[PDB]
Amino acid sequence: MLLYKDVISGDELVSDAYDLKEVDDIVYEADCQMVTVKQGGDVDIGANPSAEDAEENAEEGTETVNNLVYSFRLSPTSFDKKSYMSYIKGYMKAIKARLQESNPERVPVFEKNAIGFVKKILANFKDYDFYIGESMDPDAMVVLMNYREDGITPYMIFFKDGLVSEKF
């Protein structure tokens, strides 16, 4: 029920309606489940000439999708290996300033903890993928999608430093 949004440019990055766990480091984890819904194509809010919506006569088009991405229309975008270093570097520094203006005591704990997680993320930045909200900003809240140690549990992480809690 809790709603967490970013102030830099995340806009509703995740919520507790699913489940959130903060790792000893400084990030939250919102688990997502798969649900089957009847979708008949969308392609943005308008962008098609003429169609029939028939395809076959033995299946309409049921597609399972995460409940967090569907409710928050999460939008995953492609990225570059070297481009990732520039986004995490200029983004980490951006937060460093937000602490100095708000809480300067979070500058050191945030640097050491965030530095450790970044080192374990580069080991497989591809397996963590890179998501982005409708804001379309490579310097806003960045969420990564990774499967637990099992693989049957899809979960994403949201930097707690750039995540606030909102009560209904």
CATH number, position 80 = 2.170.150.10
Q: How far apart are CA 85 and CA 75, in angstroms?
A: 20
Q: How far apart are CA 107 and CA 103, in angstroms?
A: 8
CA nearest neighbour of 115 among 95, 139, 145: 95
Q: Which domain does 73 fall in, by range?
A: 1-168
**Amino acid at site 95:** I
Q: How far apart are CA 2 and CA 96, in angstroms?
A: 26
- Tell me how crowded residue 143 is: count the other CB atoms within 10 A of its CB: 27
Q: How far apart are CA 164 and CA 13, in angstroms?
A: 10
CA nearest neighbour of 4 among 155, 143, 136, 117: 143
Number of folded domains that form the chain:
1
Q: How far apart are CA 107 and CA 20, in angstroms?
A: 24
Are 49 and 34 within 8 A, CB to CB? no
Query: Encoding tokens for residue 19?
Result: 């489940």
